[PDB]
Design a protein around this ligand. Sequence first.
Ligand SMILES: *[C@@H]1O[C@H](CO)[C@@H](O[C@@H]2O[C@H](CO)[C@@H](O)[C@H](O)[C@H]2NC(C)=O)[C@H](O)[C@H]1NC(C)=O
Ligand SMILES: *[C@@H]1O[C@H](CO)[C@@H](O[C@@H]2O[C@H](CO)[C@@H](O)[C@H](O)[C@H]2NC(C)=O)[C@H](O)[C@H]1NC(C)=O
Ligand SMILES: *[C@@H]1O[C@H](CO)[C@@H](O[C@@H]2O[C@H](CO)[C@@H](O)[C@H](O)[C@H]2NC(C)=O)[C@H](O)[C@H]1NC(C)=O
Ligand SMILES: *[C@@H]1O[C@H](CO)[C@@H](O[C@@H]2O[C@H](CO)[C@@H](O)[C@H](O)[C@H]2NC(C)=O)[C@H](O)[C@H]1NC(C)=O
Ligand SMILES: *[C@@H]1O[C@H](CO)[C@@H](O[C@@H]2O[C@H](CO)[C@@H](O)[C@H](O)[C@H]2NC(C)=O)[C@H](O)[C@H]1NC(C)=O
Ligand SMILES: *[C@@H]1O[C@H](CO)[C@@H](O[C@@H]2O[C@H](CO)[C@@H](O)[C@H](O)[C@H]2NC(C)=O)[C@H](O)[C@H]1NC(C)=O
Ligand SMILES: *[C@@H]1O[C@H](CO)[C@@H](O[C@@H]2O[C@H](CO)[C@@H](O)[C@H](O)[C@H]2NC(C)=O)[C@H](O)[C@H]1NC(C)=O
Ligand SMILES: *[C@@H]1O[C@H](CO)[C@@H](O[C@@H]2O[C@H](CO)[C@@H](O)[C@H](O)[C@H]2NC(C)=O)[C@H](O)[C@H]1NC(C)=O
Ligand SMILES: *[C@@H]1O[C@H](CO)[C@@H](O[C@@H]2O[C@H](CO)[C@@H](O)[C@H](O)[C@H]2NC(C)=O)[C@H](O)[C@H]1NC(C)=O
Ligand SMILES: *[C@@H]1O[C@H](CO)[C@@H](O[C@@H]2O[C@H](CO)[C@@H](O)[C@H](O)[C@H]2NC(C)=O)[C@H](O)[C@H]1NC(C)=O
Ligand SMILES: *[C@@H]1O[C@H](CO)[C@@H](O[C@@H]2O[C@H](CO)[C@@H](O)[C@H](O)[C@H]2NC(C)=O)[C@H](O)[C@H]1NC(C)=O
Ligand SMILES: *[C@@H]1O[C@H](CO)[C@@H](O[C@@H]2O[C@H](CO)[C@@H](O)[C@H](O)[C@H]2NC(C)=O)[C@H](O)[C@H]1NC(C)=O
Ligand SMILES: *[C@@H]1O[C@H](CO)[C@@H](O)[C@H](O)[C@H]1NC(C)=O
Ligand SMILES: *[C@@H]1O[C@H](CO)[C@@H](O)[C@H](O)[C@H]1NC(C)=O
Ligand SMILES: *[C@@H]1O[C@H](CO)[C@@H](O)[C@H](O)[C@H]1NC(C)=O
Ligand SMILES: *[C@@H]1O[C@H](CO)[C@@H](O)[C@H](O)[C@H]1NC(C)=O
Ligand SMILES: *[C@@H]1O[C@H](CO)[C@@H](O)[C@H](O)[C@H]1NC(C)=O
Ligand SMILES: *[C@@H]1O[C@H](CO)[C@@H](O)[C@H](O)[C@H]1NC(C)=O
Lengths: 432, 432, 432
Amino acid sequence: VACSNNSIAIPTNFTISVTTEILPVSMTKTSVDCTMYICGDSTECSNLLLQYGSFCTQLNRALTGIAVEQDKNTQEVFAQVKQIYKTPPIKDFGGFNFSQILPDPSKPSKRSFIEDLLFNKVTLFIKQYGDCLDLICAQKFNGLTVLPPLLTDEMIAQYTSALLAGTICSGWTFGAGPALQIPFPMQMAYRFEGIGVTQNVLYENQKLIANQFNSAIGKIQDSLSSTPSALGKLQDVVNQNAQALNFLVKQLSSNCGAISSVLNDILSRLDKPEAEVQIQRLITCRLQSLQTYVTQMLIRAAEYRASANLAATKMSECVLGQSKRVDFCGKGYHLMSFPQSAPHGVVFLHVTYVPAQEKNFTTAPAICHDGKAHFPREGVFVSNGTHWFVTQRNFYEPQIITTDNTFVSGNCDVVIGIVNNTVYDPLQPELD
Amino acid sequence: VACSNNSIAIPTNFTISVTTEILPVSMTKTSVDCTMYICGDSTECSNLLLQYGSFCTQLNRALTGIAVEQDKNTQEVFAQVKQIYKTPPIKDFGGFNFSQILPDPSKPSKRSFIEDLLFNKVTLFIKQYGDCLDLICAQKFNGLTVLPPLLTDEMIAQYTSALLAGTICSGWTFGAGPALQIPFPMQMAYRFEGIGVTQNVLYENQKLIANQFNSAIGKIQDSLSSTPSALGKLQDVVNQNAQALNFLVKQLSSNCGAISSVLNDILSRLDKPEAEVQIQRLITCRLQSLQTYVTQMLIRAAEYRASANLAATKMSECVLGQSKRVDFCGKGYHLMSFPQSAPHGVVFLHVTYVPAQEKNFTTAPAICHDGKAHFPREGVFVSNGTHWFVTQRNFYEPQIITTDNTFVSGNCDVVIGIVNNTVYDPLQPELD
Amino acid sequence: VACSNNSIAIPTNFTISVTTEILPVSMTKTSVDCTMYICGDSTECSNLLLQYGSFCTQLNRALTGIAVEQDKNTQEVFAQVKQIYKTPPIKDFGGFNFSQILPDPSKPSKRSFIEDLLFNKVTLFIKQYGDCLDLICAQKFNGLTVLPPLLTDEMIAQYTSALLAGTICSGWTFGAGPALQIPFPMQMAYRFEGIGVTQNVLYENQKLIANQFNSAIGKIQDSLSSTPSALGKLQDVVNQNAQALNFLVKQLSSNCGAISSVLNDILSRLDKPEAEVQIQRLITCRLQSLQTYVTQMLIRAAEYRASANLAATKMSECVLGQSKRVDFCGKGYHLMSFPQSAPHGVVFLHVTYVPAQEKNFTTAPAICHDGKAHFPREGVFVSNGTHWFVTQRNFYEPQIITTDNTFVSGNCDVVIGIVNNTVYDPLQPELD
Ligand SMILES: *[C@@H]1O[C@H](CO)[C@@H](O[C@@H]2O[C@H](CO)[C@@H](O)[C@H](O)[C@H]2NC(C)=O)[C@H](O)[C@H]1NC(C)=O
Ligand SMILES: *[C@@H]1O[C@H](CO)[C@@H](O[C@@H]2O[C@H](CO)[C@@H](O)[C@H](O)[C@H]2NC(C)=O)[C@H](O)[C@H]1NC(C)=O
Ligand SMILES: *[C@@H]1O[C@H](CO)[C@@H](O[C@@H]2O[C@H](CO)[C@@H](O)[C@H](O)[C@H]2NC(C)=O)[C@H](O)[C@H]1NC(C)=O
Ligand SMILES: *[C@@H]1O[C@H](CO)[C@@H](O[C@@H]2O[C@H](CO)[C@@H](O)[C@H](O)[C@H]2NC(C)=O)[C@H](O)[C@H]1NC(C)=O
Ligand SMILES: *[C@@H]1O[C@H](CO)[C@@H](O[C@@H]2O[C@H](CO)[C@@H](O)[C@H](O)[C@H]2NC(C)=O)[C@H](O)[C@H]1NC(C)=O
Ligand SMILES: *[C@@H]1O[C@H](CO)[C@@H](O[C@@H]2O[C@H](CO)[C@@H](O)[C@H](O)[C@H]2NC(C)=O)[C@H](O)[C@H]1NC(C)=O
Ligand SMILES: *[C@@H]1O[C@H](CO)[C@@H](O[C@@H]2O[C@H](CO)[C@@H](O)[C@H](O)[C@H]2NC(C)=O)[C@H](O)[C@H]1NC(C)=O
Ligand SMILES: *[C@@H]1O[C@H](CO)[C@@H](O[C@@H]2O[C@H](CO)[C@@H](O)[C@H](O)[C@H]2NC(C)=O)[C@H](O)[C@H]1NC(C)=O
Ligand SMILES: *[C@@H]1O[C@H](CO)[C@@H](O[C@@H]2O[C@H](CO)[C@@H](O)[C@H](O)[C@H]2NC(C)=O)[C@H](O)[C@H]1NC(C)=O
Ligand SMILES: *[C@@H]1O[C@H](CO)[C@@H](O[C@@H]2O[C@H](CO)[C@@H](O)[C@H](O)[C@H]2NC(C)=O)[C@H](O)[C@H]1NC(C)=O
Ligand SMILES: *[C@@H]1O[C@H](CO)[C@@H](O[C@@H]2O[C@H](CO)[C@@H](O)[C@H](O)[C@H]2NC(C)=O)[C@H](O)[C@H]1NC(C)=O
Ligand SMILES: *[C@@H]1O[C@H](CO)[C@@H](O[C@@H]2O[C@H](CO)[C@@H](O)[C@H](O)[C@H]2NC(C)=O)[C@H](O)[C@H]1NC(C)=O
Ligand SMILES: *[C@@H]1O[C@H](CO)[C@@H](O)[C@H](O)[C@H]1NC(C)=O
Ligand SMILES: *[C@@H]1O[C@H](CO)[C@@H](O)[C@H](O)[C@H]1NC(C)=O
Ligand SMILES: *[C@@H]1O[C@H](CO)[C@@H](O)[C@H](O)[C@H]1NC(C)=O
Ligand SMILES: *[C@@H]1O[C@H](CO)[C@@H](O)[C@H](O)[C@H]1NC(C)=O
Ligand SMILES: *[C@@H]1O[C@H](CO)[C@@H](O)[C@H](O)[C@H]1NC(C)=O
Ligand SMILES: *[C@@H]1O[C@H](CO)[C@@H](O)[C@H](O)[C@H]1NC(C)=O
């Protein structure tokens, strides 16, 4: 790294970067009916399952609780707007093209282009249950059932659309109060100053910025199509849950010391006093297998709550406002964030400002005018050869050092690195 | 939602809103003495429980660890001030009435009015243990005991009182260093500018603001008295723990394949070599039931740690400072937060600023004076018909556009939406 | 606490404080090979372990998953910089001495002095495995093995060094974009204004500040050497994991109702049909003991993920930037943070600004000049006896009230506490 005693580097150009962050929000809601799972509707087992007390009750309630939380997680992340907003047929945003994030009415569920890519990338035992369709299926899947969400894909898509329409047409104001319309270019102006970059930069370079933005968005399609760009975070949710269910199914073929894995064969060709023992032994193992499954699900559920809580936080701080937290809403300086829906989760597109080309300048902590030390009101002092200028830290825009750009504090005998120069007084030429 | 290409909406009025957020901090500390729980002080079981190794040791330590954490959670949230502060007998806060949050010496535990409402709203097996009062009770409750907190309700109330006295008389300064006294109206002035609202608004509308505040507080009583306003978050802590204990008790009546659920009846009327088997079978089930209980408690404890950590964060960022994080300290723009104690948790009253009435104005990104582009130093440009003004974004207070309200950057041929107008120079009239 | 109606306290001096925060990041990666752990390579057990299905498969995968996460946790916290940076041989930082945090080439692993203290303070069954060295050891430790980290101490130290070199020579810029060199004294200047303290304070008191800093660092050695200054947070990780392993080992000596705890003795002197029963009974208990162990490890792993996530957040917000969050990066106002490596965790040295000596002044919300109310542009109005001044809140530096220090809003009949005084107009003396 460069290191200096008397010099400074300042960016002369910048780029706009759009990055993708993918967070899990929820998982497929499932339930296992302990009694039929273990006994298979056999009478002898059912009676021998009551002597064990309320284990099935606790396990059923543990799983029910998880299923309920999955809907809470979803609404906490997505349902942050009470109103449903729509964009006008007029797309006049100053050169900013949002056609890939806005809903397309010709598409299924009226998803946007990018959302359609996400849905067709994540690959979703569960399908077999969906195909047989609820008791009739439960009788075939050993008490393992799948429950529908309260919010369907369309409902979630509507929330996402409303959030986007709000963000684009009214900035962040709708997240605190009433939605206040404002031209997109002006929202950007106020987001630029919000990261220490004077608003004039946007207006003067608006065309370039719009072009960099539009290209940055197009590149998203290639990133998603080329590799599992954090898509594995959602694919793993599917895979981990699927194999957990496969475990339960496989265990129903185990003996665990029992004469067989089939209750009908235990009862057949065996006197009652022993069949009771073989059944109890099989019940014990199946119950333990079920406990193992539930314990794992309780822990995973906790992980998803934490993820959902983070996703909800991101919605509030990245999308409905402008974060000052470093690397919270992506690398670089945060400007905007645009959410997209996804299978079992939420995807955030983070728009950030990043410095590019830079130059070396000679610097100084203060300027000595006439026995008094002048400090910069905003920015730093730099020398471009034989002349000194004051400029904002994040963009090399040199300006003349004047009495309106500095303040006087203390004398020239106090500051160690103070440099002799002339501060321009803008009023004297008017008197003379 | 409204959407525009050339116009803007600006709030002309505002209201003050007070919302309530309720977080769990801790749960009743309990402990189960594995050996007596399982064996009931029987000799035969005790001896047959040693052959199983250190299961009871691990379970006892798991529960002990949870109980310890409950006190850590409490002190981390509440004990953030080393000193105990008291308010003066003189309540001169500029019209702001805090009588409902400040401690009332005539009340039990010297709680405030609102706190008394919270304590009389949350409804608290455990009571039966409290009534029998420690070994004597343990012998009757099957090894299930309840431990006292290190910090009693009075001690917690004192911490809350100290935090409130600090917040009211010294703002946030005491949270970083020494407590620096400052008039309440001045603290508010500095909290208003902190959300982008010029301090003159407070002083000019101080009476209205104090009235809106006082009414907002009164409405809290109705919200708590009318419905379980997030009070269910605390009632659920009680209910979930109570039923977990009920499960353990119920399981002590189960056979789990054993000849009976009573150790005395297993030993009676049965030869030793078989009684050993029946006892071992019963021990196995009771131990498994205990493991199930402990596992659930470990997971719930984790949830409470996370909640307590959040509550501690809120204390630091909402109460002892001014959050910039969106929707972190309630909806709207954060001004102040006043904590209140509660059964097994903490309640935060969040005071936020919310925009109200609004009007439509015509806008522009810049003004063109004489071949140079003028940008607003702070706020936006708006037209009220035939005249242009500059005003702060969050409150419609129109001012004349002058050379002291703008800065010059670039020329008039660069900015797309630039509007021709006159910028007033305040010095020329003095020369002439 | 002091409380006032018409007065204010303002700090006249300050100190620099350095505090230490210690967070766990990861734990020793271990694995238990279920099959050999339970059966001890006996044939009879191995065959009788297959009838139980996929319990060993699930347990092995549960532990494997934990081990993998431990490396993820480490890289997320430390590997936030792609480049490896080095400091120059010239230590010209304006009087700031970093010799205790920078790497010393004469030391083992090229650690810094403070890091060496941390490594020699935390005390690390596991050592016995390390001493026997992988199957050969597994055969002696009952299937309990220890895995190496992907990032060795040297690699982690290099990341820490790179982060420090960056922080010192280029501030926070390298965390957002390219590394931009800047004199250390200037970085501090921009961190002081970042907490509401005018930059002139640093330059005028640079020597004092450097001295306070250097002493604050030296005191760290005494804090670590004198007491377990949060070092218990790392020692507990070692202790908790060690005893968990000791539990597994102890359980291999239990009978759990079996004829003995030794498979060779169960098989010897016992007919096969019964040996099968005694083995199955022993397998059941050993498997349950293993399940208990794994469950505990899954929960602890979750705690470490949460801790690692916080540590990663601190790296981004405290070290690679400047936090505005209260008490997030230590008590007082945050300036800088310097990370140090440690056994199984990360240590943050937080540099904060704290107000010291203070004085009482009489205050006012506004000044009335000639029928119009003047409000302070920045800071507060105070009286030092018979004269009024305007000064910044966090440091008593009184200045004359002028037209350039205030703004006019409304008239003198609106503000309640307004005080009659004279505002100085700096231009009139030039005309006259
Ligand atoms: C700042 O960087 C941008 C690129 O991000 C430069 O814009 C490009 O300029 C070249 C000509 O040198 C054109 O061929 C490209 O088409 C432009 N790109 C875009 C998106 O318009 C810009 O000129 C640079 N500005 C400075 C001062 O260096
Ligand atoms: C916004 O971007 C989209 C996507 O590139 C543009 O739509 C393309 O327009 C070209 C030219 O007519 C067609 O050849 C492509 O097939 C269109 N792509 C798609 C997916 O429809 C759209 O024209 C751009 N709008 C604006 C105002 O720039
Ligand atoms: C340092 O800044 C000065 C002032 O901008 C530069 O001098 C100007 O150079 C331009 C040509 O690029 C001339 O048209 C101006 O008339 C010059 N102004 C003055 C006051 O001389 C100077 O060249 C810069 N130093 C370097 C090395 O570029
Ligand atoms: C900045 O200017 C001052 C004069 O205003 C310089 O101070 C003088 O330096 C000369 C030597 O060249 C001495 O003989 C004078 O007695 C000094 N006068 C005073 C009032 O100190 C100062 O050295 C200049 N600083 C720099 C960096 O050039
Ligand atoms: C801003 O809103 C407040 C109400 O929140 C208005 O104050 C009320 O004004 C009516 C008269 O129209 C009185 O009857 C109420 O008693 C007032 N309420 C309070 C709490 O004082 C205020 O006038 C509005 N101001 C503007 C400019 O619209
Ligand atoms: C602060 O608010 C309290 C609560 O309304 C006021 O106390 C009430 O005062 C009225 C008038 O004397 C009584 O009729 C009520 O019974 C009182 N309520 C209670 C709970 O005591 C109190 O006067 C207000 N103080 C100020 C300065 O406004
Ligand atoms: C736009 O602003 C101007 C200036 O404030 C308004 O004109 C003033 O109107 C008031 C009456 O409300 C008169 O007393 C002032 O003398 C007028 N000033 C000038 C310069 O004409 C104008 O009415 C506003 N436009 C609209 C539609 O209200
Ligand atoms: C702002 O004022 C400028 C003049 O200072 C206008 O520019 C002139 O426009 C007329 C047409 O009406 C041309 O004939 C002149 O040659 C232009 N002069 C220059 C220097 O460009 C400009 O059009 C005005 N803009 C608006 C929006 O009214
Ligand atoms: C502010 O406090 C510092 C100490 O933190 C004071 O500096 C000390 O001053 C005494 C003399 O009174 C010296 O003996 C010490 O050696 C100084 N300490 C250091 C580190 O230099 C400083 O004088 C105080 N300033 C004010 C205005 O009170
Ligand atoms: C930075 O601090 C270190 C630590 O105190 C200084 O090193 C000491 O220097 C003295 C004087 O030569 C020796 O007696 C000590 O034994 C040194 N300590 C160690 C650990 O080496 C170092 O000189 C200081 N550097 C600067 C520029 O102040
Ligand atoms: C209030 O402030 C005034 C102005 O600074 C103080 O008066 C000055 O006191 C110094 C001595 O310390 C004299 O040298 C100045 O000439 C005085 N200036 C004026 C205008 O009188 C005043 O002493 C301060 N009040 C108190 C109690 O210290
Ligand atoms: C601030 O000065 C104004 C005068 O500019 C004072 O107002 C006058 O007070 C006298 C009584 O002493 C009355 O007789 C005058 O009629 C008032 N004039 C006006 C325009 O109101 C005001 O009292 C002074 N305020 C303070 C705190 O001294
Ligand atoms: C650069 O280093 C020299 C010592 O070699 C020092 O005297 C000078 O003051 C430093 N420059 C600045 C701006 O500090
Ligand atoms: C600035 O100087 C350093 C060496 O001190 C060099 O490595 C770096 O490339 C220079 N940067 C520019 C833009 O010239
Ligand atoms: C409003 O839209 C028109 C196109 O219909 C455009 O020419 C004009 O510049 C827009 N107004 C502003 C302020 O951008
Ligand atoms: C502003 O104009 C929109 C239509 O463009 C309208 O719906 C809205 O109600 C108007 N707001 C006000 C305060 O007039
Ligand atoms: C101080 O208290 C009195 C009442 O005793 C009040 O009249 C005065 O306005 C208060 N001072 C300030 C600055 O508010
Ligand atoms: C300020 O006044 C209070 C009493 O109102 C007193 O306790 C405090 O010590 C005083 N502070 C100073 C610096 O004099």
